[PDB]
Amino acid sequence: ATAILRPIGLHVEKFQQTYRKKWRFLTSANANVILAEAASGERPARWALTTGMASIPWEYLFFYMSPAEYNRMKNYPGTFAKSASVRIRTWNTRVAFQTGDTQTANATLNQNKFLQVAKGIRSIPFICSTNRKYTYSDTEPMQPTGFATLTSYEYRDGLKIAMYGYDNDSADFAKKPPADATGAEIYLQDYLTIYTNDARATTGTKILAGFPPYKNFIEEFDASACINTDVVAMDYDFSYAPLVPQFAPVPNNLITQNYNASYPAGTKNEVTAVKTTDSSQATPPTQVRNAPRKYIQGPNADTTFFDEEQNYLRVPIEQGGIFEEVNVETVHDTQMPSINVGIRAVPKLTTIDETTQANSWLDAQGYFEVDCVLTTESVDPYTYIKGGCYSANTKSQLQYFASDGRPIAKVYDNPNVYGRMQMIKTVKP
Amino acid sequence: ATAILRPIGLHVEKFQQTYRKKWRFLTSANANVILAEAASGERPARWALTTGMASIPWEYLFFYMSPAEYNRMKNYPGTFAKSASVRIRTWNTRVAFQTGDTQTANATLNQNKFLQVAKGIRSIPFICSTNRKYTYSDTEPMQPTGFATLTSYEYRDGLKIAMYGYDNDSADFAKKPPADATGAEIYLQDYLTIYTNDARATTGTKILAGFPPYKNFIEEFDASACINTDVVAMDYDFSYAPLVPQFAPVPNNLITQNYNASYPAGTKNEVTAVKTTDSSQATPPTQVRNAPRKYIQGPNADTTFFDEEQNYLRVPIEQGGIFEEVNVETVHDTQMPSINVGIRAVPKLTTIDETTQANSWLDAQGYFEVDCVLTTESVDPYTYIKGGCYSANTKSQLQYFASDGRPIAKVYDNPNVYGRMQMIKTVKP
Amino acid sequence: SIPWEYLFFYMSPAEYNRMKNYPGTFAKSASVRIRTWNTRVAFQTGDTQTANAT
DNA sequence: CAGGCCAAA
DNA sequence: TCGAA
DNA sequence: CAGGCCAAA
DNA sequence: TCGAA
DNA sequence: CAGGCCAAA
Numbered sequence A, B: 001a002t003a004i005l006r007p008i009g010l011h012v013e014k015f016q017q018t019y020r021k022k023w024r025f026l027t028s029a030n031a032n033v034i035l036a037e038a039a040s041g042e043r044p045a046r047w048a049l050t051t052g053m054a055s056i057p058w059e060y061l062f063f064y065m066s067p068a069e070y071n072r073m074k075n076y077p078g079t080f081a082k083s084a085s086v087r088i089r090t091w092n093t094r095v096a097f098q099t100g101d102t103q104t105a106n107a108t109l110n111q112n113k114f115l116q117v118a119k120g121i122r123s124i125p126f127i128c129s130t131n132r133k134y135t136y137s138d139t140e141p142m143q144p145t146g147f148a149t150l151t152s153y154e155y156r157d158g159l160k161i162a163m164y165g166y167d168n169d170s171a172d173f174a175k176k177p178p179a180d181a182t183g184a185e186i187y188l189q190d191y192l193t194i195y196t197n198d199a200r201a202t203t204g205t206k207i208l209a210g211f212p213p214y215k216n217f218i219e220e221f222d223a224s225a226c227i228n229t230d231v232v233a234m235d236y237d238f239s240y241a242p243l244v245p246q247f248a249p250v251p252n253n254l255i256t257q258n259y260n261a262s263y264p265a266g267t268k269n270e271v272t273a274v275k276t277t278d279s280s281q282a283t284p285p286t287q288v289r290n291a292p293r294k295y296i297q298g299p300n301a302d303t304t305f306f307d308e309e310q311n312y313l314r315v316p317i318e319q320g321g322i323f324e325e326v327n328v329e330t331v332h333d334t335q336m337p338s339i340n341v342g343i344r345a346v347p348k349l350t351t352i353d354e355t356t357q358a359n360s361w362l363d364a365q366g367y368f369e370v371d372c373v374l375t376t377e378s379v380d381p382y383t384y385i386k387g388g389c390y391s392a393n394t395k396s397q398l399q400y401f402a403s404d405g406r407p408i409a410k411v412y413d414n415p416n417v418y419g420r421m422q423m424i425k426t427v428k429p
Numbered sequence C: 001s002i003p004w005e006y007l008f009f010y011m012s013p014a015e016y017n018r019m020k021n022y023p024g025t026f027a028k029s030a031s032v033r034i035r036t037w038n039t040r041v042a043f044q045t046g047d048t049q050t051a052n053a054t
Numbered sequence D, F, H: 001c002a003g004g005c006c007a008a009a
Numbered sequence E, G: 001t002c003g004a005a
Helices: A067-073 A151-164 B067-073 B152-163 C013-017
Strands: A002-003 A011-028 A033-038 A048-050 A082-089 A116-119 A129-132 A134-136 A144-147 A191-197 A219-222 A231-236 A264-265 A272-277 A285-290 A293-295 A322-326 A341-345 A364-382 A395-401 A409-410 A421-423 B011-028 B036-038 B046-049 B081-089 B114-119 B128-130 B135-136 B146-147 B191-197 B220-222 B229-237 B273-276 B286-289 B291-296 B321-323 B338-344 B364-382 B396-400 B408-410 B423-425
Touching: A002 A364, A011 A341, A011 B067, A033 A144, A082 A341, A191 A341, A231 A341, A264 B423, A285 B081, A341 A364, B011 B338, B036 B146, B114 B229, B191 B338, B229 B338, B338 B364
Parallel strands: none
Antiparallel strands: A002 B220, A011 A364, A033 A048, A048 A191, A082 A231, A082 A364, A116 A219, A116 A341, A129 A191, A134 A144, A264 B273, A272 A285, A293 A395, A322 A395, A409 A421, B011 B364, B036 B046, B046 B191, B081 B229, B081 B364, B114 B220, B114 B338, B128 B191, B135 B146, B273 B286, B291 B396, B321 B396, B408 B423
């Protein structure tokens, strides 16, 4: 029999977008030295071991998309980041012909140059590491002598301004010609740092294990043979990266009496849980279901995380485990692999009278060409005939919140805890 | 070596039973009109859109089995419903030659007849719908003008009495000759109804989305070409449909000191949880393990749900997620697909002076032949030598209970919440 | 008249309201297909003096 | 040799 | 399977 | 085109 | 796998 | 025919 109607279902429009950037980065070949970091609050006294492996911030949205693209993206509710890709090529590595010292005839045409690549060091459970900005000595510019006070947020903000420039009405407009326009090189300042405990003032039983042998977890190549070659190629598929919240549904409490109904979940976990661990071992690991949560669209929505533009440069793109959907969901913890690349410090051609590492270095600089692609997807659903887009309420989203109203998000800036990236309260910009 | 004994194990007898019925149903081709339903308690003011798609109650035990079969089934502890099957055939659709109005010469031999089939509309998250019994206007018998106060329980009870008749000593015996004996046609009165919010008195922000386009989720066929053809064929395998509780085990507290022992569950969920959601979004979704439960056989058993015969016509056959077994179990939420079939209203042959739908209709009637089969299974276990059947205590069953002692069961009469069938307290008959 | 020349013939108020968020929108093509069903003709007219039913 | 541990695969 | 095979 | 969401498969 | 493949 | 139940596989 002829069918005059068939179940065609909803009209839903899906939109895929792609964002590409090309960056050229300059890195300094820092010496590996030990710096003391004094105790401060809950931070214990510790030793820090510096490197020249600059952090590549491929985990953040500004790395892939301009302020104009970001501003336009807010007009597409339900936008999810789907995949991110990065390719790193190295160019010729420059090493100074001589050092500043005049007493030694240290100039030499012969060079030994080495390129260092570290993938996924951030997640190694027994290596405590972060990316830090150093201060350097005036006589030895390759030698860190302390820590800059710049935060990770401020570092990424400065990188973003270098990439995309100021507003046309800024008094400081001329200070940063946008590399997205010129294609000029940008200096990176955030370097992989390895920590270990400082037991000088420790009372009772001391842990005297020294350092982890972190060189056993990096790749090091002859830089003379890597000119104009790819050294890193990484692809990442996001688990849950909601960049713009979904369209709100038509609220069923306006239509139904049973809007606050209950139903079986069986043995399935449909509400996520928060895991807390304690490496001091004063308390055992705990798992708590039904964390404080807020809807991010709809009647009582709290959109602070998206209103504050946290996901542009302050927090990583991947946020799996931080958000919930009201359906029968399966959620796991997430983290993107870290990327650090750089040039090993080049010792100055001179004699020393002891069996030690070098104490003076030649100026050396890495030149890295970075390609990056980000793909996203958004939806325009029409559940109802009038009044714009509305999604099914099974698409409704929630976000972890703290009791003071601050949204909670994943952060990659702190060292891993049991190989995990912690989630912390966001800070208002 | 010759074995004089081998581990033959327990003697367990398994019994399979099959229940068949054939029903012939008459449906009215109701007009699609909008009725206002005023606010009442937690029920908000809403608009209702009527249809002629009659509900087919294939989710209930009385649809498949007579009172004699049901009464006998209570003698088989551990009876589970295994599968249910329904087949629907349509016969010739009757449309009135003319309407009651005399002023218009509206009689015509030409007809356009359409059959509507809706499968699984009940579970669609963005469509708020139930089955309702209407009141109709006297001048337009196809036109609903209000809602009857009959409950779903009373509707199904009346259907059951029509199918199987009264007791031989009833004063009303002659009023309902049983269709199970005569094979005569029965009129159905419960029709699919689509709701949307009524914002006439809403203060603040209004939702003005109108209706969902529900026609995009049904199949509609030329009824002139469907005579004597199958239109619906559905099969359902039950997850957990306990019709009679299992034989009680020999209680180990009479034999052992460690009857209240504890043991690891590991990371597996062995006790089910209740999920509560809130479409008003005042609270986030919550999941609670270890709900109030009662054993349904054994020492402290509460058999109220089965003593009250709730599963015959008041609650659906499928109850997965409502019951637990003491073993290492895996449980998920359940619901059977809904079935609604009917004839579209046939406009009267007349002119109207505006661009609207028809306001007058011809009497029209659907004729549906329904075959239904239900298969069940029960067990007689002999764990012990004397005193009748006893099961292993790993077969012990529990049911969700409310704090006032009412058993909790799934219900299909309310609109879905996030695509789920809610569980509510049962009501004493 | 079949008003296939107008936007409301093809798109709902919700779709129209959402479409305003896409600057540079152009309508590219429009298609219409018309099927006829059974034509109904009255058995008789209202006049009683003539036996006109057929 | 990267993504919820690696000494598991 | 909220990577994905 | 139905059974715990569909815009996922 | 308390559908079931 | 044993290892988180057996009347499930």
